[PDB]
């Protein structure tokens, strides 16, 4: 009726006329995303179509979560909403959902590949860092931070992204978490342990090392080598840790060949660091000591968000209004240990769009 068909790649876009001139910027882990102009508002905004949402109990749970989370999280570093709509009219008609949100200038995969300075890099770390702290401040782990999901503005801002997974620690592992990027998968994930708010930091760890090394920290050629690669770098884990890992995994992870591990003083020389020479608190050895406490195998000994923000490298940008920020409160409907039908996610998801406009 009042929407229009935008021939984009494969599935065609049927967005409001508000959004015109659609170009592709990426394809997240749900549908696809474009950087169109929203005349009505005056500024380029990202429209995300989740073509056929409720295919199954998966792309329908990651959605209801994405929806609610989107409308609940507000923060200077955690991307915000803007508009959500469905080109379909009737209750049955529904089969697609478009999401309009902010739109930076690039994605971290652009900085990673450039020579920052200190004050700066430390700001983004802080930046990105806070957003994280906030999201957690509601018992919400993201579980997927990685350049492909981090966005920085030319004015040097920065925002987290994709709340398609970011759930709460209510359930444990799964021998099918292969969805969360390898190079940024944390030990408790890999080893199918059981995550907590911390996991997110590890991601942030494999990040910095990337903002420093330029190469990705722990490659991996399969989810099973990932481990054989992370530990080849950080040494074989302390026996107590072993006692933690599930029965089976323990055996295998134990059989692995023993690795010395390298001190971060060599894992990140004084050279791979931004001109170590300004404003005390900063200093290369601090950018590192930071890592020194994030890149940690045993989940229970990893510098949590707070202490990170509360850390010599980060800290210099602290400020209660954007860190100890008000907790992004949740209603009382969200279900992390509960599933339904597709004709139910529909009613639920459809009844989760409508009102919105």
């Amino acid at each position: 009726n009042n929407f229009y068909s935008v021939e984009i790649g494969d599935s065609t876009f049927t967005v409001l006329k508000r959004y015109q001139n659609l170009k592709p910027i990426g394809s997240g882990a749900q549908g696809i995303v474009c950087a169109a102009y929203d005349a009505i508002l005056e500024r380029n905004v990202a429209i995300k179509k989740l073509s056929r949402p409720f295919q199954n109990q998966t792309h329908a749970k990651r959605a209801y979560r994405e929806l609610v989370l989107m409308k609940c999280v507000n923060h200077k570093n955690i991307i915000g909403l803007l508009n959500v709509f469905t080109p379909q009219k009737s209750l049955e008609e529904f089969q697609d959902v478009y999401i309009v949100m902010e739109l930076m200038d690039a994605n971290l995969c652009q900085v990673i590949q450039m020579e920052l300075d200190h004050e700066r890099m430390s700001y983004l770390l802080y930046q990105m860092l806070c957003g994280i702290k906030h999201l957690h401040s509601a018992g919400i782990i993201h579980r997927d931070l990685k350049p492909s999901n981090i966005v920085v503005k030319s004015d040097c801002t920065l925002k987290i992204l994709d709340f398609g997974l970011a759930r709460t620690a209510g359930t444990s592992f799964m021998m099918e978490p292969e969805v969360v990027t390898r190079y940024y998968r944390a030990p408790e994930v890999i080893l199918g342990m059981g995550y907590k708010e911390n996991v997110d930091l590890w991601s942030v760890g494999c990040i910095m090392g990337e903002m420093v090394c330029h190469k990705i920290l722990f490659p991996g050629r399969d989810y099973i080598d990932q481990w054989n690669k992370v530990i080849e770098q950080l040494g074989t884990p302390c026996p107590e840790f072993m006692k933690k890992l599930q029965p089976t995994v323990r055996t295998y992870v134990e059989n692995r060949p023993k690795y010395a591990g390298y001190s971060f003083e060599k894992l990140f020389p004084d050279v791979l660091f931004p001109a170590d020479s300004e404003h005390n608190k900063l200093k290369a050895s601090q950018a590192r000591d930071l890592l020194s406490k994030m890149l940690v195998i045993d989940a229970s000994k990893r510098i949590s968000v707070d202490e990170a923000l509360q850390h010599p490298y980060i800290n210099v940008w602290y400020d209660p209004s954007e860190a100890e920020a008000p907790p992004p409160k949740i209603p009382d409907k969200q279900l992390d240990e509960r599933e339904h039908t597709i004709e139910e996610w529909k009613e639920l998801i459809y009844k989760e769009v409508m009102d919105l406009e």
């Binding site: 200038d105 690039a106 652009q110 900085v111 450039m114 004050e119 700066r120 700001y123 920085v152 503005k153 030319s154 004015d155 040097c156 404003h279 210099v316 940008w317």
Partner: peptide, 10 residues
């Protein structure tokens, strides 16, 4: 000290 507000993304 105050944070920066640039970032040459080219």
């Amino acid at each position: 000290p105050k944070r920066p507000t640039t970032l040459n993304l080219f």
